[PDB]
Design a protein around this ligand. Structure first.
Ligand code: HEM
Ligand code: HEM
Ligand SMILES: Cc1cc(N)nc(C[C@H]2CNC[C@@H]2NCCNCc2cccc(Cl)c2)c1
Ligand SMILES: Cc1cc(N)nc(C[C@H]2CNC[C@@H]2NCCNCc2cccc(Cl)c2)c1
Ligand SMILES: C[C@H](O)[C@H](O)[C@H]1CNc2nc(N)[nH]c(=O)c2N1
Ligand SMILES: C[C@H](O)[C@H](O)[C@H]1CNc2nc(N)[nH]c(=O)c2N1
Ligand SMILES: C[As](C)(=O)[O-]
Ligand SMILES: C[As](C)(=O)[O-]
Ligand SMILES: [Zn+2]
Lengths: 405, 405
């Protein structure tokens, strides 16, 4: 029939064709010989121009003026600017449209149903590492909004030819310290050992808990990184407790409310924003299953299982499954009680099916990474599991980038 | 060229160099990944001849006699036969090697640690449905072994240029019927609705049960299929009860012990066996999660939930996750009680990790489809979730083929 990928939903038996994949101008890791879909990781004025033209057309299409006078002029306005400086700048609303497009285009984000609701903070005037700090404090403030979380992204100056990038060293605006012990173990979060040690090498006076909030290593162009400590009043956290197991609270586990990625590059129309932290609100399994149960993270499965008096001697007791469920229930329950925005993997995948249906009608498909869309617990119990998906790269987009050091 | 495969729990790395032996293509392309798709969207003597050499080369290397006399002589035989007749035949030993390799190369199978222990029944001297049926009965008696399941395959006559294929119409040799009730609902297994009808349309006296073992429709070349009924005593079944929830058994749930796929095609050295049913033993999740909990299957989550008195009012109570875990527990308990081989998803993925290791040293890699290797529940609580995988097509291989109607 149609010569586009055929996508089927094995629950509902429905079929769709992805025609949006044809707009993709960037190749992925696969080839007909082998699929590398499970791997976590992967200017020429000539090429910059085409990327920019493509973006501008996308913008004007979004406002329904393709072929118009404003459109053809803006195109000429960009070729002119690139023609005499090698780069070009985006208009305010062009930045707001691209930032939202990049989110909407993110194949791994299950929360894209919210893609249209992104508060974009233009911080392209920012010229000092101290100022970056200010912008972020504002970001954290606006997004945290006392628990009623709001999606937001702050965009710092774009990379300049022959100039240092604006960079945020931490992977997230809020992350707990990871202290390499004497005996080899790690106190806190093993994911952040390297960032923690980098903070110390830079003057941070380390604490010694399992939940010490790390300071930020911010960096203005061509200068070494300045170190900033977030005011505790700003970093809202939720102490975890179980709705029925009274001892869970005794574990002293907790998590911060704001998930804010900060080391990703925001690419729009060829331009590169190396410092453009974005935040939303958590899906419960991020905390409850990955951060708290991953063998290489807090690894609290055994502890909790012992507490529940489960048979952790044999696998067939499903002691891991039982505890993981309760840890997640606790993340959900605690956040709800503290009145901090959160969403469980059921609600979250259900709204993503809705997003899929919306996008089918609006663009003819949705780039999605199945392995990342399906939750880390109860996989086939959510509807996305039964939904085939086509994964590809559209731009604007968010991309991983080499750590600055 | 060669892909780098990484394990994110241990930080270990490997290089898959086995994918370079993949002669057949997948659904992916550099532009878009279609790895989550469940199905893919006489032969010239020259092509068949090379697939045959390759396979014969594979076989002799396997027994350490490559280059030897027997090897060169065998290659001539195959060539003499292809040239003269446009096809050739396998020697029993070669057939046993091919079948074992086909299982070894099954990307979606997590039970491969066992690949070397497979009882192979050569049934190529079959000339009728009635004969196929005797063969199928012996396979079941052998594989079932009174609950101490043994992995087996039975291979019927290869396909032949212009002449119908021998075929087993059922997808598995043991399936429960799915009867469409008046109200659009379905009594029994909804997945087996079409097949349950085809048997009726071919004279079977249906039942009115939720777990009515279907009869087998066996088709010898160019002849309407024939209906055979499995002797109730040949089909071992397990009654499901819960290790602590006494009310569970009252649900009258039960599942068969033998998982035996019968509608897939086995390809060895370019030859095609359109009827080669194979079986092993179950992994608890297949029954507890997918069979009993899939929306489009027996869909028993709600019932079990209410029976556990759970707030099924909101998703955030995780009633679904809680119920699913108990159901998987009943399956594992029940089978261990009935002394019928079964393996839970933790033990299973652990052994698969070991297998990737033996395969790494042995062949330079191992094709795996991440989405299928990671269990349907508690995904990240298993080692496989954290393991990157390269997926491609090796031969001998098991392929999907059109339904014969
Ligand atoms: C509004 C609520 C949101 C929810 C619950 C949500 C949820 C998620 C989840 C569950 C993941 C996969 C995380 C993982 O397993 O590592 C993810 C990935 C991602 N999300 Fe969202 N997201 C939200 C908001 C946002 C916003 C505001 C942006 C961008 C403006 C965004 C951009 C991304 C990107 C680029 C990824 C892929 C990169 C990565 O792996 O971290 N998300 N999101
Ligand atoms: C002995 C233990 C065995 C177990 C626990 C096991 C388990 C599994 C599981 C869980 C899958 C995923 C299927 C699904 O859930 O949809 C799978 C797929 C598969 N297995 Fe195995 N397996 C075993 C033995 C065998 C044997 C004996 C063969 C063949 C000789 C085999 C051939 C395959 C093939 C061809 C597939 C992919 C095709 C499909 O079913 O969709 N398995 N196996
Ligand atoms: C805005 C936003 C909202 C939201 N709810 N979730 C996210 C996702 C982040 C919060 N949970 C972890 C994830 N961060 C990135 C995941 N791992 C990235 C990675 C890749 C390769 C190597 C390493 Cl070490 C880490 C972002
Ligand atoms: C030997 C073996 C042992 C074992 N433990 N499990 C299996 C797996 C099979 C038994 N449980 C599910 C799977 N059957 C095939 C899965 N889907 C097939 C399919 C393909 C196309 C369309 C549809 Cl609808 C279904 C095989
Ligand atoms: C190796 C494997 O790709 C890796 O563990 C992936 C699997 N799926 C994931 N899915 C999400 N949402 N987040 C992750 O970090 C991962 N990790
Ligand atoms: C479309 C999607 O890939 C499909 O539902 C897959 C996902 N993972 C699976 N994993 C296993 N073991 N078995 C399956 O049938 C599936 N189905
Ligand atoms: C905390 As212990 C039970
Ligand atoms: C079985 As009802 C509670
Ligand atoms: Zn792929």
């Amino acid at each position: 029939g149609p010569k586009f990928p055929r996508v089927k939903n094995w629950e509902l038996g429905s079929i769709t064709y992805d025609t949006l994949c044809a707009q993709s101008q960037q190749d992925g890791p696969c080839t007909p010989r082998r699929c590398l879909g499970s791997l976590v990781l992967p200017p020429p004025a000539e090429q910059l121009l085409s990327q920019a033209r493509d973006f501008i057309n996308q913008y004007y299409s979004s406002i329904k003026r393709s072929g118009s006078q404003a459109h053809e002029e803006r195109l000429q306005e960009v070729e002119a600017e690139v023609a005499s400086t090698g780069t070009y700048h985006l208009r305010e609303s062009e930045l707001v449209f691209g930032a939202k497009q990049a989110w909407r285009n993110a194949p791994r984000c299950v929360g894209r149903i919210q893609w249209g609701k992104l508060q974009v903070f233009d911080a392209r005037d920012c010229s000092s590492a101290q100022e970056m700090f200010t912008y972020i404090c504002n970001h954290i403030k606006y997004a945290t909004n006392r628990g009623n979380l709001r999606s937001a992204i702050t965009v710092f100056p774009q990379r300049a030819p022959g100039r240092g990038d604006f960079r945020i060293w931490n992977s997230q605006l809020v992350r707990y310290a990871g202290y390499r012990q004497q005996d080899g173990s790690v106190r806190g979060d093993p994911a952040n050992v390297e960032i923690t040690e980098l903070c110390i090498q830079h003057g941070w006076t380390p604490g010694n808990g399992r939940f010490d909030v790390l300071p930020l290593l911010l960096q203005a162009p061509d200068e070494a990184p300045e170190l900033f400590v977030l005011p505790p009043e700003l970093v809202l956290e939720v102490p975890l407790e179980h709705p029925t197991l009274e001892w869970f609270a005794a574990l002293g586990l907790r998590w911060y409310a704001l998930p804010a990625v900060s080391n990703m590059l925001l690419e729009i129309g060829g331009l590169e924003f190396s410092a453009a932290p974005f935040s939303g609100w958590y899906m419960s399994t991020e905390i409850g299953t990955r951060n708290l149960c991953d063998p290489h993270r807090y690894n609290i499965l055994e502890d909790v299982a012992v507490c529940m008096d489960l048979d952790t001697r044999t696998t067939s007791s499903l002691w891991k499954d039982k505890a993981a469920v309760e840890i997640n229930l606790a993340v959900l329950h605690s956040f709800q009680l503290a009145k901090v925005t959160i969403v469980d993997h059921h609600a979250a995948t259900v709204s993503f099916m809705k997003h899929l249906d919306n996008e089918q009608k609006a663009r003819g498909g949705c780039p999605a990474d199945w392995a990342w869309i399906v939750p880390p617990i109860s996989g086939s119990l959510t509807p996305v599991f039964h939904q085939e998906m086509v994964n590809y790269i559209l731009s604007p987009a968010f991309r991983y980038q080499p750590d600055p050091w």
